[PDB]
């Protein structure tokens, strides 16, 4: 009874020979081709522009720290930024940043010269690395730097940026020291007054336009990612797939997760109302999160499979009958396809000539074996 619809009728009626008539042997169902998912335009963007594009940055010894959470980390703007000169990530692939989730994101921003950019990395040495900004050995994040001569330098020399020249001990990882105590370089106490063995721990950077890229100010923003056991608060925004019409798919509109086919509609909804229901409390139509339109949702076409056969002792040919479904969503198709109100019957040649009714189909259509 998997061979042919006539064999299916034999299977259902449990008899080798079946009398002339109509019998319901099975039911037809349109399996959805694929699944579709759409999400609205994301507005919970992380304040990347606030941290990266800020008018005033603090000094390297007083680097500002910004905690980022409960938002989507859109690195696309970072990728499209062509002014970046250094983009090195430790413990994470730069192309995998949008595909990875982190419990918390910390943004560190400061201004340093061109030749000190290489000092902002795990395991590095130097004045900035040891006295101004130190990274841990297992640091997970990315280091971003770019030229900032146009904004952090002026004609008269911008000394507003300072670095910790002298410190008694190297800075611990992720430690910000802003102490202005007089450095004691000798046995003689300073007592708050600089002298032969006493110097200020901070030195003002001399920024001039003609210094050169080797000695030009650079805006550096460091993003640190930590993976803890707490639920993640920073995740890449979801991607909205292309909208589909007139084709049965699986749609998940922000939790509707329904099945069927979406078709253009004419009804108008409330400005706030998104999706509607029928009398039977079932899904009826959903509004596009992207655009502003209403799409009717009829369930995927399905119905019983009927077989029209004459007496097996008289003939051996059968015609499939697909009720309640049009011929488009369809023995295989292509053999005298005919459509009626009852459905799409396949395997019989429609004729205008009118005879007395023999076999029931529905809607005034009767089939019989003749020439």
């Amino acid at each position: 009874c998997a061979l042919d619809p006539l064999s299916e009728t034999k299977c259902t009626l449990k008899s080798f020979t079946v009398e002339k008539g109509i019998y319901q042997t099975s039911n037809f169902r349109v399996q959805p081709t694929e699944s579709i998912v759409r999400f609205p335009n994301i507005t919970n963007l992380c304040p990347f522009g606030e941290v990266f594009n800020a008018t005033r940055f603090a000094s390297v010894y007083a680097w500002n720290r910004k905690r980022i959470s409960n938002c989507v980390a859109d690195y696309s703007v970072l990728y499209n930024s062509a002014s970046f000169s250094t983009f090195k990530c430790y413990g994470v692939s730069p192309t995998k940043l949008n595909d990875l989730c982190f419990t918390n994101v910390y943004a560190d921003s400061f201004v340093i010269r061109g030749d000190e950019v290489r000092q902002i990395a795990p395991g590095q040495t130097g004045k900035i690395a040891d006295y101004n900004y130190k990274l841990p050995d297992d640091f997970t994040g990315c280091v971003i730097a770019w030229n900032s001569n146009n904004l952090d330098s002026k004609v008269g020399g911008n000394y507003n940026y300072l670095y910790r020249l002298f410190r008694k001990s190297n800075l611990k990882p992720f430690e910000r020291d802003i102490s202005t105590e007089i450095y004691q370089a000798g046995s003689t106490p300073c007592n708050g007054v600089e002298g032969f063995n006493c110097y200020f721990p901070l030195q003002s950077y001399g920024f001039q336009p003609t210094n050169g890229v080797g000695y030009q100010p650079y805006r550096v923003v460091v993003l640190s990612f930590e993976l803890l056991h707490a639920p993640a608060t920073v995740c890449g925004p979801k991607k909205s797939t292309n909208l589909v019409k007139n084709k049965c798919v699986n749609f998940n509109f922000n939790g509707l997760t329904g099945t069927g086919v979406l078709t253009e509609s004419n009804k108008k909804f409330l400005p706030f109302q998104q999706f509607g229901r029928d009398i039977a409390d079932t899904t009826d139509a959903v509004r596009d999160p992207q655009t502003l339109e209403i799409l009717d949702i009829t369930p995927c076409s399905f119905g019983g499979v009927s077989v029209i056969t004459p007496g097996t002792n008289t003939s051996n040919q059968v015609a499939v009958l697909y009720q309640d479904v049009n011929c488009t969503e369809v023995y295989s198709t292509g053999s005298n396809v005919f459509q009626t109100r009852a459905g799409c019957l396949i395997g019989a040649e429609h004729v205008n000539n009118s005879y007395e009714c023999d076999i029931p189909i529905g809607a005034g259509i009767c089939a019989s074996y003749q020439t």
Partner: antibody, heavy 122, light 110 residues
Framework: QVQLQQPGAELVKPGASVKMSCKAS????????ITWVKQRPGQGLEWIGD????????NYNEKFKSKATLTVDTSSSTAYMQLRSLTSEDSAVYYC????????????????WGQGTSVTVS | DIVLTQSPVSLAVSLGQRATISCRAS??????????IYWYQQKPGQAPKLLIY???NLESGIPARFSGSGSRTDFTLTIHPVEADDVATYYC?????????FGGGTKLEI
């Protein structure tokens, strides 16, 4: 200026372990990653792992996770590659290279290469 | 794991002619307009030498004859003219996602 050196050849008994060096010079060792590539005689190139000398961060290939135990010595600016449970399939030439790992510049490009070491297991 | 196939495996090019090497990627390598495909030349008995980085830029010290193109799955490297000392093995490498893998390699004959 930049010189990267590897031992000429190494011979190891089957079932033993071999630890070979990757000596880099002419540039700041800690500022550049050290990557490793395996090339079977007459075959293509296979990646093993990459390490950053600063902090000792490691990233091992899934195929060579149980085979490659990689450590570096920043004092001598030399990277040590250790192989364990060697079989006849592990007889190949291993090359250590460097990459800056900058999305802006060169990404994973391997501009400089070492002379390599012909490892024979017999 | 992205697998890279290089065709033709064996190529013969006369003096001054053009050599065509194509590397195919099983998965897309382009990322925001950046293609991470590298071409390496390995002389016999010597380590491979990088020629083209990011599949479109010439490495310093590499002659201008070597040139690359292609994007996404398909990448093409063109060498013109081809000299006598070009006999080596050319490898294409992808680095968009770990683990990084290399191509099968091609043989150039004069």
């Amino acid at each position: 200026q930049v010189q990267l050196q590897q031992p000429g050849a190494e011979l190891v008994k089957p079932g033993a372990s071999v630890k070979m060096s990757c000596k880099a010079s002419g540039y700041t060792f800690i500022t550049y990653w050290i990557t490793w590539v395996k090339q079977r005689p007459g075959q293509g190139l296979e990646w093993i792992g990459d390490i950053y000398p600063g902090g000792g961060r490691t990233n091992y290939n899934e195929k060579f996770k149980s085979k490659a135990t990689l450590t570096v010595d920043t004092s001598s600016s030399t990277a040590y590659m250790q192989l364990r449970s060697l079989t006849s399939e592990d007889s190949a030439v291993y090359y250590c290279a460097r990459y800056d790992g900058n999305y802006v510049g060169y990404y994973y490009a391997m501009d400089y290469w070492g002379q390599g070491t012909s490892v024979t297991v017999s | 794991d992205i697998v890279l196939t290089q065709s033709p495996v064996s190529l013969a090019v006369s003096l001054g002619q053009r050599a065509t090497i194509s590397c195919r990627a099983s998965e897309s390598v382009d990322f925001y307009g950046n293609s991470f495909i590298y071409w390496y030349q390995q002389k016999p008995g010597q380590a491979p030498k990088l020629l083209i980085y990011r599949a479109s830029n010439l490495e310093s010290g590499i002659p201008a004859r070597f040139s690359g193109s292609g994007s996404r799955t398909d990448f093409t490297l063109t060498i013109h003219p081809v000299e006598a000392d070009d006999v080596a093995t050319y490898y294409c490498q992808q680095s968009i996602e770990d683990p990084r893998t290399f191509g099968g390699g091609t043989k150039l004959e004069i």
